[PDB]
Design a binder for this molecule. Structure first.
Ligand SMILES: Nc1ncnc2c1ncn2[C@@H]1O[C@H](COP(=O)(O)OP(=O)(O)OP(=O)(O)O)[C@@H](O)[C@H]1O
Ligand SMILES: Nc1ncnc2c1ncn2[C@@H]1O[C@H](COP(=O)(O)OP(=O)(O)OP(=O)(O)O)[C@@H](O)[C@H]1O
Lengths: 329, 340
């Protein structure tokens, strides 16, 4: 019961429980996730395994519940600047790999092959996370030939066509264009993303209220005003001062939070993310299909107070993209 | 100008000696060299009445007078045939009206009618997409709409045309048919938005921005298209249009939209749908311009552009009859062949 599982895990730490300590710490927070002592003690336990980022999260969560909790505050005050350095140090590692892909001359036969294949790779994964059953070979066939695939839903194949049209529009019209991003530009991306599936709802705002896991987004009445504030933030001086990868990740989150469409919210958000990156001089990033579980958890964590685990998750995806380019080239 | 005044005379002397088929071919060749040859129209009009073809004869005389108003030989013939054709045409609408009453006489929930009304829905889709060069079969179009799975080795654009139509008819049958009040420019765009939405979601429900050729027809410039549609919907809701016979009003509404050609694509499909909305609002079943009538469908549209729209109005009335003939036949066929 309450305050029971922690002590079991805490005495196990003295013994050297190893996995047995962790399992009980996880079970203790399963019964009560707002148990301030279980967070602080599991935070201390995390630093023993050199996991300072996880520890800082647990302390920050504990203080959001109990601001004046001494044991958590004295630990956070130490880790707060330490993590800020670790995070900034990770962005500088990414910035060096981004410079190493720009160092490669345009016209390289190796890069052309990768940039081509990774375009289809991005489409496969962005549709696969939302439960599209089409393979990479099938998605290649759809876009190359424009003939339908045997024994597969027309809705699934129109999702693929919708994405290709949306990226073509971005890469052509938006990426290079001078000036601010408008509410019109966001609708125009969605109009292509969902146009071939639902031509009625494509490029028009959500009219009904919906549940997204455990997230209840703004009411259709408010959605319009939420988007006017969102585009104002995108063009704000504050947002320009942020590191591209962070600004991209925050732009992503704020759109999936507002959830202004009946469908294509995740897809439009992942596209808008890449527009921010490509406008700042970063290649298009792919949140892979197998990262669906993680992708949601960091979005859950973002809703409850701390957005950083999401910002880090995007930066990790950014690195794996850059790693794939430099390797394949 | 006597390039084919020898071809007329050639055909005319052939008529005297008999030369039934030989006369026609030369009359057709005479109008091929000069289609605005007033004597070739009037003489071929006289020739037509000999085969009891008064409708064709009246067309030729009316065409001749549009070129040469005061041409005596044509005028004396037209003055006779003008009221005669008006009677023949009105008599055809009364034949249709009796067959429309005979489909309403059939009970509301008849099991035989339900089967036909279902099959003819897919039949209408097959033909409306087939005329514009869609290669999908009837069985394939049934599979698309029933299962919502794609067809092997056929373009996604062709299959999205089928989905676009089904959505457009569903919207019409549900929202528009039963709705009280006037038809608006918004309603026309909303039909097109579904018709073309699954193929071209960008241009769906938005007016033509560029100028295009349609066979030998140059439609109003994109600048004027908006005003042409405001006058079109004003005519649709006008008292004059309500006084016209449903089949004529349907056919004229069809023509005026394909004339204006206010979209990049889906002009014919939107027109054929709007036609059926007029008919169904007046209490007529949805009519199908079949795929094999593509050649005829264009000729009567050409004929309409040059002055006389009646051949089109008659072409729609003929399609209306063949629809009603198919329903009454199949319904009586199934009544015996099905249980109940
Ligand atoms: N708890 C959450 N809070 C906020 N956003 C979330 C949450 N879980 C998932 N999301 C985001 O919203 C999407 C889920 O929305 P939903 O399930 O309605 O749409 P989908 O069909 O999965 O994808 P799409 O929005 O691309 O059509 C995810 O793809 C993700 O980007
Ligand atoms: N000479 C003509 N004058 C007026 N309208 C014509 C003429 N020829 C064809 N049309 C109309 O235009 C339609 C064909 O237009 P067009 O060839 O641009 O489109 P499509 O792709 O064949 O068909 P849709 O309009 O259904 O997409 C015909 O169905 C008819 O309604």
């Amino acid at each position: 019961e309450a305050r029971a599982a922690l002590n079991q895990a805490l005495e196990m730490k003295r013994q050297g429980k190893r996995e047995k300590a962790q399992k009980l710490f996880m079970h203790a927070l399963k019964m009560d996730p707002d148990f301030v002592d279980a967070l602080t003690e599991f935070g201390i336990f995390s630093e023993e395994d050199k996991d300072i980022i996880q520890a800082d999260y647990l302390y920050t969560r504990a203080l959001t519940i109990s601001p004046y909790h001494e044991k958590a505050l004295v630990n956070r005050d130490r880790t707060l600047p330490l993590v800020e350095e670790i995070d900034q140090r990770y962005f500088s590692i990414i910035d060096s790999k981004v410079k190493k892909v720009m160092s490669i001359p345009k016209g390289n036969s190796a890069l052309r092959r990768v940039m081509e294949e990774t375009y289809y790779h991005h489409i496969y994964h962005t549709v696969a996370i939302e439960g599209n059953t089409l393979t990479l070979s099938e998605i290649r066939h759809i876009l190359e030939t424009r003939y339908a695939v045997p024994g597969k839903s027309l809705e699934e194949q129109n999702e693929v066509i919708g994405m290709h049209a949306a990226m073509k529009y971005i890469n052509t019209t938006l990426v290079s264009r001078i000036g601010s991003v408008t509410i019109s530009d966001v609708l125009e991306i969605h109009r292509r993303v969902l146009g071939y599936v639902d031509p009625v709802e494509a490029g028009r705002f959500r009219t009904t209220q919906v549940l997204v896991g455990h997230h209840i987004p703004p009411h259709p009445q408010d959605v319009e005003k939420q988007m006017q504030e969102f585009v104002q933030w995108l063009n704000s001086e504050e947002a320009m001062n942020l590191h591209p990868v962070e600004f991209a990740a925050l732009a992503h989150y704020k759109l999936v939070y507002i959830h202004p469409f009946i469908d294509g919210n995740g897809r439009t958000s992942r596209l808008l993310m890449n527009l921010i990156l490509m406008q700042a001089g970063y290649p298009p990033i792919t949140i892979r299909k197998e990262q669906r579980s993680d992708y949601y958890h960091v979005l859950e964590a973002a809703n409850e107070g701390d957005v950083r685990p999401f910002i880090r998750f995007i930066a990790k995806c950014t690195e794996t993209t850059l790693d794939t380019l430099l390797f394949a080239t």
